[PDB]
């Protein structure tokens, strides 16, 4: 005897979270001026 399997749907996440390293210093991404030597995005661990 044989039953159909337990279905799933490997899709992308809701609203494309889990694709960008947010809020985690350690491979963190920066908006800045081109000649600025600065950030405008510094992240913290507890912030979501």
């Amino acid at each position: 005897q044989a039953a159909p399997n337990r279905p799933n749907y490997i899709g992308f996440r809701d609203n494309f979270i889990g694709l960008m390293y947010y809020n985690s210093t350690g491979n963190m991404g920066v908006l800045a001026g081109q000649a600025s030597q600065l950030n405008a995005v510094v992240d913290l661990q507890d912030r979501n």
Binding site: S36, L38, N39, A40, V42
Partner: protein, 58 residues
């Protein structure tokens, strides 16, 4: 650093009613590290007011 210090805030003792030993204020600081000259001379102009309000309040 030495000139505009972040003020020592106390802590309340509920049992004895005395002062529980103070601590550096570490929960109101601006994150001015991502700022050029036209604001880090403004942020230091803010802390230099709360270090003068707290002396005209004391």
């Amino acid at each position: 650093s030495k000139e505009i210090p972040t003020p020592y805030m106390w802590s309340y003792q509920p049992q004895m009613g005395l002062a529980a030993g103070a601590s550096q204020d570490y929960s109101s600081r601006m994150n001015w590290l991502s700022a050029g000259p036209h604001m880090i001379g403004r942020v230091n102009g803010i802390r230099a007011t709360r270090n003068q309000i707290l002396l005209e309040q004391a």
